[PDB]
């Protein structure tokens, strides 16, 4: 759509003067006369047939006068069923060098939100299969999750176990979207995913579609990575009707990169230093993840809290959209419990009897109670002694020890390491097992036999075999 000469290059900001075919805002340009593709996405209009745009690769070797075309659309990306098991950057090019992605139709990355009369009005609960997550902090469908806990906690093994559970009972594929990630750790993620079974370099038996925008790529191309990993995630909602997942790592580097684009243009900053459009920019990304009538998109996002400040402007704005939290802490790994989930500091907004029912509420409020007093009398038994607690306190020692080991589970994606078969438990098998420990029907079981089993019938089975 016409030819426009360049007229200014300042940093990661290019300035393109068209003649007739003036493109709309959010239109992707393509510079001609270069080695690999340099795209430019139009962000303003300035008058005098001049636009201004944010570059998405290095801005070196650009001469004042180069001819740049117009695609007549936004950034269009390969969207298909043959994009799983592959890796691409923000503008669709493959970077695992396994061959070009041979696809039929393309899709632009900028759309609008679902309509007011396309929503769903009855809240439902997306079971994953994990024991702690299903019960004490359940996921919604269409909901948004927060994942707290850095490296050294048992984190990436949780991500791959989610993807090997969503495709064994639900049938919806996923997307990974690393936003500004490390290039050194994008390869240990790729090479662990190969040997675990989710990406397969031989056939049509993949589950994840990696979209890596990495840390040495300019700030204009770091904000747009969660949209390109959202655009892929809608073909398995719109055009196929499945229950998509979507991982963003992490939700702070999406926010931090928006403040760099907004300060290269010239906009005056907000409170503590962020951009003025901080809640709308998070709005137009987070509103495209809903449960429409065809299918849904779920999301799982890791959050970094700067300077231990839970009222900082970036995690304040992100908490306004969340429907859950998950906290991975260093201490629960020391006990030997996997995954390292803190069941007292992990929440869920739909924890309410009108949404989850009556049976599920009066168990996840009972097993939430028995682990609160044990943290209190983890001091009285630590100073005064052992036999000096009451005989009704020799049962809050048992039933707060038998339970916090049954929050452990042998995963399936780490199959060769543990040597044990990966077990799955449905949502009525989580509830049937936790009720019988507060009822004390299995009060005659040692606290080690409640370790790395599946249903309630296995812990009992495991105990019989011992000794």
């Amino acid at each position: 759509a016409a030819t426009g000469r360049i007229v200014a290059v300042i940093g990661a900001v290019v300035d393109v003067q068209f003649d007739e075919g003036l493109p709309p805002i959010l239109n992707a340009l393509e510079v001609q006369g270069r080695e690999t593709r340099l795209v430019l996405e139009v962000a303003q209009h300035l008058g005098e047939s001049t636009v201004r745009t944010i570059a998405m690769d290095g801005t070196e070797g650009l001469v004042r006068g180069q001819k740049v075309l117009d695609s007549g659309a936004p950034i269009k990306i390969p969207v298909g069923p043959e994009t799983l098991g592959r890796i691409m950057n923000v503008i669709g090019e493959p970077i695992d060098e396994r061959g070009p992605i041979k696809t039929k139709q393309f899709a632009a990355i900028h759309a609008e939100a679902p309509e007011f009369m396309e929503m769903s009005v009855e809240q439902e609960i997306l079971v994953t299969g994990i024991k702690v997550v299903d019960l004490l902090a359940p996921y919604a469908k269409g909901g948004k999750i927060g994942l707290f806990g850095g490296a050294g906690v048992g984190k990436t093994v949780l991500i791959m176990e989610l993807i090997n559970n969503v495709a064994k009972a639900h049938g919806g594929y996923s997307v990974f979207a690393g936003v500004g990630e490390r290039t050194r750790e994008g390869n240990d993620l790729y090479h662990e995913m190969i040997e675990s079974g989710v990406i397969n370099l031989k056939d049509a038996t993949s589950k994840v579609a990696l979209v890596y925008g990495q840390m040495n790529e300019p700030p204009g191309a770091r904000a747009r990575v969660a949209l390109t990993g959202l655009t892929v995630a809608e073909y398995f909602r719109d055009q196929e009707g499945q229950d998509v997942l979507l991982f963003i790592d992490n939700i702070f580097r999406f926010t931090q990169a928006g403040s760099e684009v907004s300060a290269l243009l010239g906009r005056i900053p907000s409170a503590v230093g962020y951009q003025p459009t901080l809640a709308t920019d998070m709005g137009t990304m987070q509103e495209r993840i809903t449960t429409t009538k065809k299918g849904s998109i779920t999301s799982v996002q890791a959050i970094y809290v700067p300077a231990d400040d839970l009222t900082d402007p970036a995690p304040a704005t992100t908490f306004a959209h969340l429907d859950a939290t998950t906290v991975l802490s260093r201490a629960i790994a020391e006990l030997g419990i996997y995954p390292a989930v803190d069941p007292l500091d992990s929440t869920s907004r739909i924890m309410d009897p009108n949404i989850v029912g009556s049976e599920h509420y009066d168990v996840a409020r009972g097993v939430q109670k028995i682990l609160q007093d044990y943290k209190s009398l983890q001091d009285i038994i630590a100073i005064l002694g052992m036999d000096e607690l009451s005989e009704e306190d020799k049962l809050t020692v048992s039933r707060a020890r038998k339970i916090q080991r049954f929050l452990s589970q042998p995963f399936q994606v780490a199959e060769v390491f543990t040597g044990h078969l990966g077990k799955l438990v449905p949502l009525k098998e989580t509830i049937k097992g936790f009720q019988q420990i507060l009822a004390g029907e299995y009060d005659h079981l040692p606290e080690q036999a409640f370790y790395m089993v599946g249903p309630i019938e296995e812990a009992v089975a495991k105990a019989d075999k011992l000794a």
Partner: protein, 127 residues
Amino acid sequence: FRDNGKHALIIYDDLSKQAVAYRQMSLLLRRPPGREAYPGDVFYLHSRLLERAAKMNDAFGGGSLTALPVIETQAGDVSAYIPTNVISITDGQIFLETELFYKGIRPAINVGLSVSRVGSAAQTRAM
């Protein structure tokens, strides 16, 4: 409904998000900011909106319009910039505590800090 002798009620939810969406509209046109980068007139935004809830006398119909605004606070600060622009407008407050809600008392209304300046003289004699 006010000016035709009928009785109305309006509820905003919430007025702290109209003020972050007016801060954006005023930063982008390069107007000088203030405390927490709020513009100079984040008071007149909310005063001229909440001045319109009135009770008219019997010449003008005798109809009424009641307004219940909503503000969100950050970990319990009732001395921030915006919650002291609305406390000094409305005729009372209904404080809700984040400590009372987790302990179990729901609706977690703090009875020691919730008042009504004018609504004492208008309630039923049975109560």
